[PDB]
Amino acid sequence: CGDYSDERGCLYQTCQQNQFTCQNGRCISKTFVCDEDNDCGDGSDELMHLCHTPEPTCPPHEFKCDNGRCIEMMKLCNHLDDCLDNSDEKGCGINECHDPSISGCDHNCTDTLTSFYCSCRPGYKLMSDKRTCVDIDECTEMPFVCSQKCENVIGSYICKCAPGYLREPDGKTCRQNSNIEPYLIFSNRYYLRNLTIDGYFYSLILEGLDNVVALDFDRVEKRLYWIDTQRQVIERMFLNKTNKETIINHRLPAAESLAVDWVSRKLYWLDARLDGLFVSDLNGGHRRMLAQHCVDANNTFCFDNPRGLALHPQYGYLYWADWGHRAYIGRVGMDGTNKSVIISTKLEWPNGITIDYTNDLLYWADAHLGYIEYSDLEGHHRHTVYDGALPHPFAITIFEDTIYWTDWNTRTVEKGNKYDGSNRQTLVNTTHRPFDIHVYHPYRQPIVSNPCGTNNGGCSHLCLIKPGGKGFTCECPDDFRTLQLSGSTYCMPMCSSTQFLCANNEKCIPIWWKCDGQKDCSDGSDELALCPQRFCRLGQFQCSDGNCTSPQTLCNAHQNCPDGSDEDRLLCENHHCDSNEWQCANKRCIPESWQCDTFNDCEDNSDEDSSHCASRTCRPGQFRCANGRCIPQAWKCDVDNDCGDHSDEPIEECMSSAHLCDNFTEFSCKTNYRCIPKWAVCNGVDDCRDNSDEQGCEERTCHPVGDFRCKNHHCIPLRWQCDGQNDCGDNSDEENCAPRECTESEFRCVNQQCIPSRWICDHYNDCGDNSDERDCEMRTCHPEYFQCTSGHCVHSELKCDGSADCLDASDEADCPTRFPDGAYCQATMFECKNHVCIPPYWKCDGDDDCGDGSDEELHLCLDVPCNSPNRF
């Protein structure tokens, strides 16, 4: 039919018809036989995939004839017409090299039974002329010849060792000279571990963390920073465990990776949700988003899922990786400039990334493809440490000549040679995923001077090293406009409302942190003496009436606070939403994806303003369709009209040669023009409509290690096996599962199931057998929890919060009035005998929520005469 049909059935190309990647039933005669007729799928003409010329291969005991035969070496020049071209006789090479007139070669001509050939001395590459030998640049061409640095020599190479590395007498090897002995540092799900390099000693640096996926040390101060994604905090601690604190706790929707700078004394971390790389001092005083949007200057590569970081202060470049649709390993200068891509080919899931400071080689690991590669810092010559046999590596660090990587599927730490991946040794296996890894050693952070030097190089807030490891650029916090003065910079204090500005202008804290019982500003202007007593708890907005409302509800186009300052004109004037939150006319904030989502999500309905959606300028990396909705570029030219209108599917271009599935990962489905990835194949889901992904799962194989095969021919990671979840529908994963051993901070139920140690007497019977909730009076409790009189544990934060989390309500009745005025309820709420601050609307509201909050207010509302009482 026509192009307006916008639908196609199963073509089922059989003999002559051959549906290409764009599903075009072109003739079978077009297979490179002078016929590039199918420009649509482009499969009819292939530059090298269709040009093979595979004649030359034949057994070495056979001399290939010029006619194409493979006359035997014994039959070579056997005085018999063995071939049509008679290459055996026609070709009888006699002392061609001995003849000086012909076969003149550079180093060493080697004769044969037919014609001649030549060989070059070691370190000299033979030229295409087959007579000229050219010296090999072993330092760049084959960097694995030398450990650490190298110098090119004519016909050979000289290896050296960086300072601190003692060169071994054997040569081409280096050995450390530091006083300290290096030991691996990696983070489990709840534990920071301490493992020696040889794997002889195992330890536990710190436990009791929700979910740690990243860590990085600081040689200067002997600190150890990490990220708790579940808790959304960036915390640091001394190696001796003397002090622990939360550096950053605000605006961390998801922090995949972290990299501590040990030169400019800065902290960098990637944010997957906000899609940007941030910078802050080791105390988190000043924050600034350094990079955002796309990185290729063409919008092909953009921050989608950045989960790797590696600092090289010697050149001031911070390499990072992204496992989105368009995987890239691009780098940025530490000052936030020179944003550029490095490696963008043969890459699906670059989870891990590191920089070998010894020889300046950028190492990265791919999860789906399963390889580990190293290249120059400009990403020119890619060499594979491993072919891809690794099931699913996540983190990678290099020390001396050994590369240490942590693999999720095998749930273990493995090490090998940094160049050829030899001596692959499994150090220790962990019950949980191994996550980020590092090698703690003074050499891992080489000493290099700070261009800032002092006073942040005379910068007001931030001093970031310029690219190339020379000079610095002044910066400003996120809430400051960076003006470039004459030979200097000025940070405009321009800040939105609902955000206090310190008198010293050090930072722009939120308004609800002004006079919050804490001197948030270093000056302390926020906690002015002349300020009303704030009865509301920290992290809450206090209205003039004294009621407490959530800061998220501030200026939410709804008069939540009775006093009215919630929607006050001055407080909502110049209100700015989050970076990913698209502001509406009524100042209500909605996610940027909802800007023209075709849904009246915002009360003012500005999210469906035709005028603004027609004139909607969209961030790079997302495709704009007719409706004005901006789906991601990966959602453009897909079989599914994600935008709804077929404008998101330029079927002319979608069937054209522009959209061809990547050979490495993107698997083309024959019936449509879909380009689902390789790991999307046989995922048990109809990822592409024709179900071609799920057709060959019986023929499809699994990874030899770190993969479990189910009865449905489903390959799943070995870690997912016996996880208590049916990863494969046939329950083969959970068919036979001996209970696993519980870790240090895991309590073992009588059901032989491991639960977090914090959940004993959780007051929610998390374990099925309810064995966790026993002996609570004899259990004391954890240091960070308050114990109810009944004996159960509760968060110390939830104490005296107006919420009786304890059943006996002891968590609230053991504290005085929330304010010295003489009452417990700040927002005119109802306080029962248990001192629970039942909301004023919730006062005498249907069921008796409070333990002793039974109300005789039948006059206001008799219990029997209640709508809530659906069932007598």
Ligand X SMILES: *[C@@H]1O[C@H](CO)[C@@H](O[C@@H]2O[C@H](CO)[C@@H](O[C@@H]3O[C@H](CO)[C@@H](O)[C@H](O)[C@@H]3O)[C@H](O)[C@H]2NC(C)=O)[C@H](O)[C@H]1NC(C)=O
Strand partners, 19: 25
Q: Name which of 58 and 823 has its Cβ closer to a copy of itself.
A: 58
Of 96, 221, 478, 642, which one interacts with ligand X (CB under 6 A)?
221
Cβ closer to ligand X: 266 or 636?
Answer: 266
Can you list the positions of beta strands (E) in 12-100?
18-19, 25-26
Nearest CB to a copy of itself, comparing residues 88 and 831: 88
User: Least Å distance between CB 604 and ligand X?
Assistant: 44
DSSP annotation string for 262-273: SSS-EEEEEETT
One of 31, 156, 176, 194 touching ligand X (CB under 6 A): 194
Q: Which of 29, 140, 177, 429 binds ligand NAG (CB under 6 A)?
A: 429
Please report, as residue ranges, which positions from 322 to 351 form the binding site for a copy of itself (by CB under 8 A): none
Amino acid letter for position 837: C
Does 238 contact ligand X by CB under 6 A? yes
Give me the numbers of helices (H) and strands (E) for the chain, helices first please: 7, 55
Is residue 525 within 8 Å of residue 531, measured between CB atoms?
no
Out of 61, 125, 481, 558, the only residue in the binding site for a copy of itself (CB under 8 A) is: 61
Nearer to ligand NAG, 185 or 427 (CB): 427
The binder of 387, among a copy of itself, ligand X, ligand NAG, none, by C-beta within 5 to 8 A per type, is none
Considering only residues 22, 65, 71, 76, which one is a binding residue for a copy of itself as defined by CB under 8 A?
Answer: 76
Contact 28, 34 (CB under 8 A): no
Tell me if 867 contacts ligand X by CB under 6 A. Answer: no
**Alpha helix ranges (H) inside 433-565:** 455-458
Q: Return d(Cα 313, Cα 318) in angstroms, integer.
A: 8
- Residue of 95, 101, 179, 298 interacting with ligand NAG (CB under 6 A): 298
Q: Which is nearer to a copy of itself, 109 or 462 (CB)?
A: 109
Of 250, 222, 251, the C-alpha closest to 236 is 222
Residues 456 and 500: their CA atoms lie apart, in Å, by 25
Beta carbons within 10 angstroms of residue 43's beta carbon = 23
Q: Does 425 bind ligand NAG (CB under 6 A)?
A: no
How far apart (Å, rounded) are the C-alpha atoms in residues 146 and 138?
8
Nearest to 406 by CA among 354, 348, 346: 354
The item of ligand NAG, a copy of itself, ligand X, none sharing an interface with residue 330, based on CB under 5 to 8 Å by kind, is none
589 phi and psi angles, rounded to 5 deg:
-100, 130
Q: Which stretch binds a copy of itself (CB under 8 A): 72-80, 564-572, 774-782, 830-838?
A: 72-80
- In the complex with ligand NAG, the residue whose CB is nearer, 300 or 789, is 300
Run of H or E including 66 = none
Q: Out of ligand X, ligand NAG, a copy of itself, none, which partner does residue 61 contact, by CB within 5 to 8 A per kind? A: a copy of itself
Give dist(CA 601, CA 134) in Å, integer.
69
User: Given candidates 13, 78, 489, 598, which one binds a copy of itself under the rule CB under 8 A?
Assistant: 78
Breaks (C-N over 2.5 A) in the chain follow: none
Of the residues 98, 121, 241, 833, which one makes contact with a copy of itself according to CB under 8 A: 98
Q: Which is nearer to ligand NAG, 268 or 404 (CB)?
A: 404
Nearest to 250 by CA among 266, 274, 217: 274
Phi (first) and psi of residue 368, to 5 degrees: -65, -50
Q: Which of 240, 455, 486, 736 binds ligand X (CB under 6 A)?
A: 240
With respect to ligand NAG, which residue has the nearer C-beta, 107 or 149?
Answer: 107
- Which residue, among 338, 283, 638, has the nearest Cα to 473 in the 3D structure? 338
Q: What does 201 interact with, of ligand X, a copy of itself, ligand NAG, none (CB < 5 to 8 A by kind)?
A: ligand X
Of the candidates 473, 475, 481, the residue with the CA atom closest to the CA atom of residue 501: 481
How far apart are the C-alpha atoms of 376 and 386, rounded to whole Å? 17
Closest contact distance (angstroms) between CB of 330 and ligand X is: 9
429 binds, among ligand NAG, a copy of itself, ligand X, none (CB under 5 to 8 A by kind): ligand NAG
Question: Least distance in Å: CB of 345 to a copy of itself?
Answer: 39
**107 binding partner (options ligand X, a copy of itself, ligand NAG, none; Cβ < 5 to 8 Å by kind):** ligand NAG
Among 31, 340, 344, 641, binds ligand X (CB under 6 A): 340
Note the helical H segments in 134-248. Answer: 138-141
454 binds, among a copy of itself, ligand X, ligand NAG, none (CB under 5 to 8 A by kind): none
Exactly one of 378, 784, 847, 852 binds ligand X (CB under 6 A); that residue is 378
Task: Select 189 or 441, whichever has its Cβ closest to ligand X.
Answer: 441
Whether the CB-CB separation of 747 and 758 falls below 8 Å is answered with: no
Which residue, chain included where needed, has tokens 């006062």? 843
* CA nearest neighbour of 261 among 465, 440, 399: 465
Nearer to ligand X, 236 or 514 (CB): 236
User: Which residue lies nearer to a copy of itself by CB, 33 or 74?
Assistant: 74
Q: How far is the CB of 68 from a copy of itself (least distance, A)?
A: 20
Can you tell me which of 196, 417, 540, 598 binds ligand X, judged by CB under 6 A?
196
- Choice between 298 and 736, CB closer to ligand NAG: 298
The one among 16, 67, 108, 765 contacting ligand NAG by CB under 6 A: 108
Q: Is 380 in the site for ligand X (CB under 6 A)?
A: yes
What is the Cα–Cα distance from 151 to 157, expressed in whole angstroms? 6
Compute the distance between CA of residue 806 and CA of residue 804 in angstroms, rounded to an integer. 5
Any long-range contacts for 22-26 (C-beta under 8 Å, 24+ apart)? 22/654, 22/655, 22/656, 22/657, 22/659, 22/660, 22/673, 23/655, 23/670, 23/671, 23/672, 23/673, 24/655
Residue 300 interacts with which of a copy of itself, ligand X, ligand NAG, none, CB < 5 to 8 Å by class:
ligand NAG
Distance in angstroms (rounded) separating the CA atoms of residues 267 and 225? 9
Residues 103-162 that bind a copy of itself (CB under 8 A): 110-113
Phi, psi of 608, rounded to the nearest 5 degrees: -120, 25
Between 447 and 862, CB nearer to ligand X: 447
* Contact in structure between 849 and 809 (CB atoms under 8 Å): no
Contact between 74 and a copy of itself per CB under 8 A = yes
Out of 152, 173, 232, 300, point to the residue binding ligand NAG (CB under 6 A). 300
Q: State the Cα–Cα distance between residues 556 and 549, nearest whole angstrom.
A: 11
Stretch that binds ligand X, among 23-31, 237-245, 305-313, 418-426 (CB under 6 A): 237-245
d(C-alpha 411, C-alpha 394), whole Å: 10
Query: Cβ(245)–Cβ(234) under 8 Å?
Result: no
- Does 204 engage in binding with ligand X (CB under 6 A)? no
771 binds ligand X (CB under 6 A): no
CB of 195 to a copy of itself, least distance (A): 49
Q: Select from 306, 451, 467, 791 the one that contacts ligand X (CB under 6 A).
A: 467
Closest to ligand X by CB, 239 vs 651, is 239
> Whole-number minimum distance, CB 225 to ligand X, in Å?
13
Residue with tokens 């400019």: 264
Which residues contact residue 765 at a Cβ distance below 8 angstroms, ignoring those fewer than 6 apart? 772, 773
Q: Which does 76 bind (CB under 5 to 8 A by kind): ligand X, ligand NAG, a copy of itself, none?
A: a copy of itself
Task: Report how far residue 272's alpha carbon sits from residue 214's, in angstroms, rounded to the nearest whole number.
Answer: 13
Element (DSSP H or E) covering residue 652: helix 651-654
Token reading at 9: 């059935």
Q: Which residues bind ligand X (CB under 6 A)?
A: 180-181, 183, 194, 196, 201, 203, 205, 221-222, 238-240, 242, 338, 340, 376, 378, 380, 467
Q: Which residues bind ligand NAG (CB under 6 A)?
A: 107-108, 119, 298, 300, 429
Q: Which residues bind a copy of itself (CB under 8 A)?
A: 61, 73-74, 76-79, 95, 98, 110-113
